């Protein structure tokens, strides 16, 4: 019996493809190439920094990842362009079904929370901009723990804040690596696989695999 | 004053491009595509498994990564092909200058060791096959620590086995992420950048950047 739901932010509720536009507007033609690398370095820097115990918040990791991407592509990223592209993450667009689904889940009397790598500021900005702030009971950031996902200390944070046991909290994630972690932690996991990717080969299998949040609403 | 040198194995002393051949022989035309993904999942699985505290040796991680790669490309990887491709890693070919350089470093009275993610069996096979076994004082595997690089517990292992303080051990690595870790640990680091890549954006900078081991020999 689930009483709450924890959602990953970037790539699950909000689409990061929105960034490719701003990237191509700054570096015409290469927008897709920049965004692709940026996304990869962003994740890599959070994983590697947590392992070396050298933490910096998501915004710093994002700035560092962009600086590496441009330097790696030979692109001259000036100060203002840097700030501009990085500000794009504060205006992501929610996936089409996201807004209506959040309302229905909430209406069913479910506790809804966000467990993201983003800083408390980032998370706030993104959800408020999309005007979805009111539909969330908790907006959790990994920041207080000074470590990123998939470190169990991050997941534990969701269990504490919601005041429920992990077995009554559903974990919804688009990244198969994130779902693997939460599954290892003990959260019953729902994987949102819209693009038909395959799960990671790290010993885990989600409890549910759906194509969008729509299937989640109908799970209740 | 350096008294010993720790070397990363896969990609630093021995070339993993040797695998692309066996891959293309099994799946003609797609050999490069398979190898590329395989290498990436291999590293990802070691990082993610260490973070979830769900360790399996390098050989297992390698088998799992190949199984994901083929399933992800739509390729039918049968049991025998699986074993065959995986056995390729036990026969990698050392970079051209590697053999002669190892002899000169050793001749200079330097303690030489290998600190690799590979299993004790893997490491042994690879170096013995190339006939370089005798040029190494220690062949260290992360296995005993039950965790992979860049976890500091892995690096500490090199400092203990060589019986020297980290400041007298030179760390030679081709992967900029590996060099970042060893640099954080305290090892004076030499990065072997043959293909002109850029260093990672994780706060570190190697002490030396060279194009091959040749420059290392001339460093003494």
CB contact under 8 A, B201 and A52: no
Dihedral Cα B73, A206, A203, A6, nearest 10 deg: 120
| Rounded CA separation A219/A57 (Å) | 35
The neighbour count for residue B120, using CB atoms within 10 Å, is 16
C-alpha distance from residue A75 to each of A31, A70, B18, B205 (Å): 11, 5, 33, 21
User: Hey, which residues 144-183 in chain B have their CB within 8 Å of chain A?
Assistant: 150-152, 177, 180-181
Where residue B47 sits, what CATH number does that domain have?
1.10.150.240
| Rounded CA separation A47/A181 (Å) | 13
CB contact under 8 A, A67 and B201: yes
One-letter-per-residue 3-state SS of chain B: CCCEEEECCECCCEECCHHHHHHHHHCCCCHHHHHHHHHHHHHHHHHHHHHHCCCCCHHHHHHHHHHHHHHHHCCCCCHHHHHHHHHHHHHCEECCCHHHHHHHHHHCCCEEEEEECCCHHHHHHHHHHCCCHHHCCEEEECHHHCCCCCCHHHHHHHHHHHCCCHHHEEEEECCHHHHHHHHHHCCCEEEECCCCCCCCCCCCCCCEEECCCHHHHCCC
Mutation pick from B37, B41, B52, B203 vs chain A, by most beta carbons of A within 10 Å, is B52
| Rounded CA separation A14/B187 (Å) | 42
Same domain, B45 and B101: no
What tokens appear for B21 in the block? Answer: 């051949």
Same domain, B21 and B5: no
CA of B14 vs chain A CAs: smallest distance (Å): 24
Is A78 one of the catalytic residues?
no
| Rounded CA separation A7/A140 (Å) | 10
Same domain, B98 and B205: yes
Specify which residues B190 forms β-bridges with: B172, B208
What tokens appear for A42 in the block? Answer: 């962003």
What tokens appear for A180 in the block? Answer: 């693997």
Q: Which of B62, B90, B118 is the last residue of a domain?
A: B90
Largest CA distance in chain A: 53
The neighbour count for residue A96, using CB atoms within 10 Å, is 12
Closest CA to B137 of B127, B150, B126: B127
Pairing of strands A111-116, A138-141: parallel
Resolution (A): 2.0
Domain that holds residue B30: 16-90
Q: Is A50 annotated as a binding residue?
A: no
A172 Cβ neighbours under 8 A, 6+ residues apart: A5, A6, A7, A8, A12, A189, A190, A192, A213, A216
Where residue B201 sits, what CATH number does that domain have?
3.40.50.1000
Q: Is A22 annotated as a binding residue?
A: no
Breaks in chain A listed by the residue before each, with C–N > 2.5 Å: none
Using the structure block, give the residue that is written with the tokens 């297992």.
B60
Same domain, A11 and A104: yes
C-alpha distance from residue A160 to each of B33, B57, B158 (Å): 44, 34, 39
User: Hey, which residues 24-83 in chain A have their CB within 8 Å of chain B?
Assistant: 41, 44-45, 47-54, 64-65, 67-68, 71-72
What tokens appear for B105 in the block? Answer: 């470093």
Same domain, A116 and A199: yes
Measured between beta carbons, which residues in chain A are less than 8 angstroms from residue B202? 45, 48-49, 52, 54, 64
DSSP reduced 3-state for A44:
helix
Same domain, A107 and A212: yes
Closest CA to A215 of A96, A97, A95: A97
DSSP string, A54-116: ----HHHHHHHHHHHHHHHHT----HHHHHHHHHGGGG-EE-TTHHHHHHHHHHTT-EEEEEE
Q: Could you give the residue ranges of the DSSP H alpha helices within chain A?
A: 18-26, 31-52, 58-73, 79-87, 98-107, 120-129, 152-162, 176-185, 214-217
Same domain, A83 and A111: no
- Dihedrals φ, ψ of B122, to 5°? -55, -55
Measured between beta carbons, which residues in chain B are less than 8 angstroms from residue A71? 198
Same domain, A103 and A132: yes
CB neighbour class for B67 (10 Å; exposed up to 12, middle 13-18, buried from 19): middle
| Rounded CA separation B148/A181 (Å) | 17
Closest CA to A201 of B40, B201, B105, B36: B40
Measured between beta carbons, which residues in chain A are less than 8 angstroms from residue B64? 201-202
Same domain, A109 and A120: yes
C-alpha distance from residue A70 to each of A17, A33, A58, A75, B195 (Å): 18, 10, 18, 5, 18
Q: Which of A32, A67, A90 is the last residue of a domain?
A: A90
How remote is the C-alpha of B95 from its chain's centroid?
Answer: 13
Same domain, A42 and A151: no
Measured between beta carbons, which residues in chain B are less than 8 angstroms from residue A202? 45, 48-49, 52, 54, 64
The count of residues in chain A is: 220
**Residue of A72, A150, A152 lying closest to B48 (CB–CB):** A150
Breaks in chain B listed by the residue before each, with C–N > 2.5 Å: none
| Rounded CA separation A162/A140 (Å) | 10
Closest CA to B148 of A183, A47, A39: A47
Question: Is residue B57 within 8 Å of residue B94, measured between CB atoms?
Answer: no
What tokens appear for B121 in the block? Answer: 């069996």
**Residue of A45, A53, A151 lying closest to B51 (CB–CB):** A151
Same domain, A115 and A8: yes
Same domain, A214 and A137: yes
Q: Which of A67, A90, A113 is the last residue of a domain?
A: A90
Domain count, chain B: 2
Closest CA to A92 of A55, A118, A63, A111: A118
**Would you give the end-to-end CA distance of chain A in angstroms?**
10
A133 contact B CB<8A: no
């Amino acid at each position: 019996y689930i009483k709450g739901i924890a959602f990953d932010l970037y790539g699950t509720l909000f689409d990061v493809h929105s960034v490719v536009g701003r990237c191509d507007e700054a570096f015409p033609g290469r927008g897709r190439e920049i965004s692709a690398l940026w996304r990869q370095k962003q994740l890599e820097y959070t994983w590697l920094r947590s392992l070396m115990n050298r933490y910096v918040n998501f915004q710093q990791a994002t700035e560092d990842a962009l600086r590496f991407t441009c330097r790696h592509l030979g692109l001259d990223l000036d100060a203002r362009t840097r700030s501009t592209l990085c500000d794009a993450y504060l205006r992501l667009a929610p996936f089409s079904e996201v807004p209506d689904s959040l309302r229905e889940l909430k209406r069913r009397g479910l506790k809804l929370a966000i467990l993201s790598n983003g800083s408390p500021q980032s998370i706030d900005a993104v959800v408020s901009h999309a005007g979805l702030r009111d539909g969330f009971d908790h907006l959790l950031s990994v920041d207080p723990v000074q470590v990123y996902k998939p470190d169990n200390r991050v997941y534990e944070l969701a269990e504490q804040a919601l005041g429920l046991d992990r077995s009554a909290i559903l974990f919804v994630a688009s990244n198969a690596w994130d779902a693997t972690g939460a599954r290892y932690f003990g959260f019953p996991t729902c994987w949102i696989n819209r693009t038909g990717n395959v799960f990671e080969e790290m010993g885990q299998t989600p409890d549910w695999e759906v194509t969008s949040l729509r299937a989640v609403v109908e799970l209740f």
